[PDB]
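Please predict the structure of the following assembly.
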Amino acid sequence: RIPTVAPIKLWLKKDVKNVWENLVQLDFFTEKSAVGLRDNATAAFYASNYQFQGTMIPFDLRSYQMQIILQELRRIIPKSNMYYSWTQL
Amino acid sequence: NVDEVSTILVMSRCGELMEDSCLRKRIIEEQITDCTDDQFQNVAANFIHLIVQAFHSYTGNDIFALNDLIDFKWPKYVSRITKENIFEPLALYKSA
Amino acid sequence: FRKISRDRGIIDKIISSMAPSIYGHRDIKTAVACSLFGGVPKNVNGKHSIRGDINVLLLGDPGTAKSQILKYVEKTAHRAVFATGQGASAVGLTAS
Amino acid sequence: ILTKEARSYLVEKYKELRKDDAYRITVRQLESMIRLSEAIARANCVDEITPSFIAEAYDLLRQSTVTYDKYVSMMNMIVRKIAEVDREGAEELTAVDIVDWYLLQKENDLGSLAEYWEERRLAFKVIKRLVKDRILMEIHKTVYVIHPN
Amino acid sequence: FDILCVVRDLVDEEADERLATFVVDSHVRSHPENARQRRLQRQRKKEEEISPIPQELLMKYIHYART
Amino acid sequence: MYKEKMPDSQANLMDRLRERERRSA
Ligand SMILES: Nc1ncnc2c1ncn2[C@@H]1O[C@H](COP(=O)(O)OP(=O)(O)O)[C@@H](O)[C@H]1O
């Protein structure tokens, strides 16, 4: 949607990896079946020993889910943001 | 915030690379007689502002992530400094 | 005619001349070239008959000049009749 | 009639469009670009089909506060203007230098002396929007350079 | 049918560049621009640009071969 | 094309649009 030339960078898939890691740390994403914190140490003992599927599948195929719905994004994201128009479908 | 991260590394990492071995070898090689430590800070400071603006969308609003790119790229950034890169960071940016 | 006839390798001259304003499609232009000249309608010993003309079917994606060639065979063959699929009726083709 | 350079620009643009389909564009769309350029020049006096007309036909066939188009119009003008001094090697441009250039590219579109200050004020605001989007990297003059993206 | 000509509109930069540069020149020539003789010379001149055989002869040549 | 490269006019650009405005009527 831009006039052409009469004679915005797409970041590489590698550089996005650091960007992807930040979103999992800040709890915007979460794993598909993330049980989370256990209640007791004995229960956590099993968790620290067991190896789930997500710890072995590749970094680019770990299924996540979202804590914020696009409606809440559109309620919070400033309208001055360029991607505001992409908040909806 | 983005503004604070820029200022934090300016206050923290300025003195770190003003006294590294790599530059003070190159300064003698380039025979920069007019160099001063006040210039030395701003020369290193320009590197932080550029790398932040270059990689803020990459690293994020993170201090830990930025503190390593300021290390790896620094010797290579040091190499491109010549007699013509002392006063104009724009040309130094062009070389690097 | 015989001056051109004695030219070495005349076949590729005719094929290259089949609708020259269409790029490529040489294995299709040869079918057009072969159908325009036709074969021998051999009425074998009278009691048996075989058709002589070459039938060609052009099939492919839109934007491949499958129709404009048929707008060229009309202008090149001695006698040509053009028709369109839905615009033609069974009675209108065979006899009325 | 199609100009000689228009042929090269047209084949380049057709290659660019055909790249994206790895609907789907056929050579009918190449003829359509030729025909749309013919129509646009038909809405003008000059028979020379400059690459500019093919650019408009390409954009129209491909596309299938401040208003969106008015702001985006400022984008290509300033993006390529800065890329000029990259090839030229001339001095880089400040915000004011860019704004002075822009208004003189549309002297005729201006209507009133009051609008002289209105669009000038809008240009600086667009600069902030562009820098905020990080298409220009600010260095120190307040030097604006093509951001490393 | 005797000959079936399957056509694929596959995508390739080298194939596209050759085909497009041919078509863009085709619209250059098919576009308009003893006067009878002078202009008839021009038409067969453009036939020589693109065809090894003059088209009028080829029509007759096909007719002669068929007969 | 990029013909308007160096029309380095003075503050008369305000007077430039007076001609655009005052004569249009
Ligand atoms: N190989 C080709 N060389 C030159 N022009 C072509 C070629 N293929 C298609 N075209 C152009 O595309 C158009 C195709 O028209 P048409 O024959 O109706 O397509 P279809 O194959 O769907 O019948 C023509 O106008 C022609 O100019």
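The two ends of chain A are 17 Å apart (CA to CA). The beta strands of chain A are 29-31, 64-66.
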